Subunit: 224 residues, 6 copies
Amino acid sequence: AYRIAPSILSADFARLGEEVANVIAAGADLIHFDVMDNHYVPNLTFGPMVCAALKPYASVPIDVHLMVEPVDDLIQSFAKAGASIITFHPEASRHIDRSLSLIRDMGCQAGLVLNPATPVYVLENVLDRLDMVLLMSVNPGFGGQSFIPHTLEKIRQVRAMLDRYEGKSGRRIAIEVDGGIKTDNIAAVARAGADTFVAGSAIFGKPDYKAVIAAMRAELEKAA
Amino acid sequence: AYRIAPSILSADFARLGEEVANVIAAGADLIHFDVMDNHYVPNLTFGPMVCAALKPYASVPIDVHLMVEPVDDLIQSFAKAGASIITFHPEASRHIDRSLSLIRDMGCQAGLVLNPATPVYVLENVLDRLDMVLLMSVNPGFGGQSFIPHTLEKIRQVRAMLDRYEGKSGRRIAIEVDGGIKTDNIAAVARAGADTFVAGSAIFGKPDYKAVIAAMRAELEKA
Amino acid sequence: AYRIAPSILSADFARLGEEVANVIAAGADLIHFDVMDNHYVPNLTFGPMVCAALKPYASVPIDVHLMVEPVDDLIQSFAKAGASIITFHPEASRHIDRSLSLIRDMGCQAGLVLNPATPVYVLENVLDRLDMVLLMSVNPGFGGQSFIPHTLEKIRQVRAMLDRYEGKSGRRIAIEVDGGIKTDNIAAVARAGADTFVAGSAIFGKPDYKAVIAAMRAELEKAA
Amino acid sequence: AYRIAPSILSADFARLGEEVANVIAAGADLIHFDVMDNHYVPNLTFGPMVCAALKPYASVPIDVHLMVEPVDDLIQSFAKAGASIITFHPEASRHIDRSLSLIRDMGCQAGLVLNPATPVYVLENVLDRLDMVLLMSVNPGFGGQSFIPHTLEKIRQVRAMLDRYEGKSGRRIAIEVDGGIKTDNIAAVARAGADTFVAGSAIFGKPDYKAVIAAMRAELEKA
Amino acid sequence: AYRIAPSILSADFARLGEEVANVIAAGADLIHFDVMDNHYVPNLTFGPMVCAALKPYASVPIDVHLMVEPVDDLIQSFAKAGASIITFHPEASRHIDRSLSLIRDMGCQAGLVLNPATPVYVLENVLDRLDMVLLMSVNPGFGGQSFIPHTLEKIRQVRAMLDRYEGKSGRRIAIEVDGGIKTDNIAAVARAGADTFVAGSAIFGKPDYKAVIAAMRAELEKA
Amino acid sequence: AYRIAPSILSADFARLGEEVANVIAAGADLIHFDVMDNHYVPNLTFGPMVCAALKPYASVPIDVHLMVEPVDDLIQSFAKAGASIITFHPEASRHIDRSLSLIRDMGCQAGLVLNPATPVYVLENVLDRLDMVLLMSVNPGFGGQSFIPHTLEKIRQVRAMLDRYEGKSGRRIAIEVDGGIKTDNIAAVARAGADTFVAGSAIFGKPDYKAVIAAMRAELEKA
Ligand SMILES: [Zn+2]
Ligand SMILES: [Zn+2]
Ligand SMILES: [Zn+2]
Ligand SMILES: [Zn+2]
Ligand SMILES: [Zn+2]
Ligand SMILES: [Zn+2]
């Protein structure tokens, strides 16, 4: 089942509860939270108290993407604030295996994020720790950027790795993609092998979230 | 005039526009923004896009307190997002004078923040750059903490320094205090020499912001 | 009462329990622990597990001097390992007041350390948090260095500040000095106003700790 | 020959010379030193002066594992303090080749350490600099943790790489493993291709080091 | 077409314009600038104002190698100072793809640098961003060091990767090598697959730059 | 005796030896070197190899101002490269007293630099270590900026402190000022208590260095 994860980075921060409720009413499967500390990326967004404040409105799981360094303290705070999934960048933790283990020990699904330049081999020794891999199709920091075409090849490479792992372990690790996903390209991203699609500006930047998500669903029906 | 500056760190982040509108309806003079980057303090709060989103609701000035390091990039982005006042901690900038000058060059009032341990003498060479001094009466990072009594002596010391500076320059630098300010202690903070009072939990943690701010106003009349 | 605090930085690390027992038998009032993380100073010494291992041998209080940055995690670990006093350098903590409060909340006496260049004014806003002030008479990092003569004036300045504070609060904050203290200069350090004296090479570098400490006591009787 | 390298991280720091002498009497081939600076890992252990103090007791080589960042200053000081082998984490040095060269230029055998997540390919361009590769089977920082099963696959991968390198160069690079090694799993670690085994809690946490090391030797005979 | 890129790190800094003019008169194809910030490498060299001052003398392109961290501010200032090519180390930028894009958006050719230990796979996801790959044959920081023999294998590996990419895209990415290149080894570097050769001490440390460059050209004609 | 110290930050880096020779011919007493590592200040200038290259041209002492962090490695390399005076910022060294001692132990005169915001009290515990105090009259990083008027008060404060120290010790510590010094303001800087004057753009940005320095001398004779 394909999952659509609207990114609140593009929402109206003066009415965040309404924005979350409205995108859930439109069919969102996850609420995607882009957490930036002004150090790992050149922008500062929102911390765990924002996650806690939205927990009563989030009848679907909250997916926290940590663009912060280091990561372990915010892993704990976001878990306590109600996150369901936490992902972080391997470059941002000296002890990646420990950080992934901590996410699961805090009760959350765990994942790693690949920047455009980050090789996929960074995943090969932590597959048993992973519930999801997020591939960035833009350079992290900002919404509204354009999908980097080479990401399709990386998605195919990750999918092949995860297909082989599922054959050995029986576990399916999810593939999420974040960056410039639009109705007009979502089918290509799914065809490359992804199953979870983060979109900010394409949804929140439009007047009718129901129409956008339905149009994305119709394109995904073509990829299937 | 005394200014009351409710701190949105204690507000409902799911309904921030309503919270800002309601505290302005209750008599807020400024909206206080506690910006934390998880490096200068052990907490992460909210960035310039939150300031920009609240600008249409803020009919009073936005007062941005940067608990971040370094500071110059966020000075620029908060100014562009509609901040009216920007303050930062001297320990967080290698070039304090440059950072204060940048705030004014971006169109904003500029200030420095003193942590509880920070000596007042860090202000003495930048008075011409300052519009406000913020004294922390708690260790920055968290709301709901208790006012540190020694802060009253520091407020008196800063007020004496700024009184002397006004005698020389004719310009009055404002004094703000942040940390554990409540109705039952606000008069003492004013008597020590402060004029702008940040309060988070005492306002946003209560059901009627109008009642709290009016009660603070009544205590300030005694100061 | 004057306190002598032998510094284990100069002891035989292959027989640390014996060294602690022997210096206590010689009249030590405190065991001084110089903790260095290779970042705040250009040397690496010993961590909290060494403190824990010596706790059964330390029938006198353990005085931990943190030459580390940042400080709060090691404050907690050294307190849990049995430290009685913890001091740190104000330059090494972004939130000095918080760090001093944490030391006391962990059940320990709290202090700040002044490097040779550090002005005394850094103490003026945390006197209610302080149980001790340590003045370095050498640049931290190494034993066996020579006492910097200007330290005497700084000790006098701190003593005057603490005398005035005691007049207002009734609390006496202790003054410790660390760096090149020897039998031949300890009386001058006491005359300047200090009450607690750290010595490493002058004690542990000699064959008879009883003789050294007794000679220090005799010189301190002259300062009194 | 298989080498057993007891880790003093788990020893009695009040009687370190006795501990070293006793584990050597029990058959230790190396004394393993876990050096932590509270920055590369969230723990602080012991510096070069502890190595120097143990040198007169160490009739077998001292194997220093640097969990520190940066590494070059401590490479030099541990070499001067009597280390025989020095290993460090590639992530902790901007110039890995330079750091490995420095270890050998100081008279020591040189190695790299792989954290559980670290890919083996980080070794492929420095084989001529290496005397040993250490694979962590736990996340570095603490003794007493449990062996991560995936480490066996990584050991096999490293052994295959080093077998190919020996075919080309004629030189055998040793493989060390550190983390949760016990009598009941040491044979599996050897079968995967390792030859040097670090153990802390399994040896120093037991009353008779001779019995533990002999029992490990008996299991290695089955490998 | 082979390019020789004399490295001004080895030139007379009191007469830099003459040095640049003289090496161009000798046949230089590029002027190589080794920029060091004392943080990414343990040396400090020269900043963008030096590039700007040499722009009037550089009738051939200026090739800036950034051994600095972070990189984006200096990418911009070197581009504005007249650089034609800018390369940096992937380890020095958190967002490698962004930094490479910025170089091209500033009007320059973009490249990545591989330290001796750095795996070639760090290039595989940014080939569309690259105009050049620089392989260090010494540990960066200093001139006058000796060529690391394993570099030849890495050059071959990069050339195979770039050959496959040229077949897919039609774009040829250049391969530069820097570190201990001399007349007596330049042919072997070319045979391994490189096309651009940085040399400092071999050129500037000799009295006749024309003779050295001619001798290098003659060895390359044999390659 | 007033000293004029032209700052090569404003010189023609393509002809640095000629620039140094020409400013010495014009009456320079020192050659001022503004060393920036892109970390302590947002600019990168020139390292010790540039100092070494100018040593044969510098018949007057070289005065190195380190705007770098940390400082001790560059203290050593600039001393070895021929510096006569080395100054650094107290905020840039964890162990200020050690760093000042190192400068003298390397054979150089030692000093501290005060940024515009830096309090003078940072000097009070190292007077025995100091040969010079430099007060910045601009925020460090760039030439061509405007003199900050409050610097005059700081100069007066430092001169009073140093006067008292000279009475106690018999040692006169020099006072240098750097930032926007021009012929039209140099007398006021001297009257405030300074004796050594760094000027970049006012000298090197003009066609006749002899005329500028002579004009500065004439204003100083009126001071
Ligand atoms: Zn995201
Ligand atoms: Zn605040
Ligand atoms: Zn100490
Ligand atoms: Zn180890
Ligand atoms: Zn280069
Ligand atoms: Zn200067």
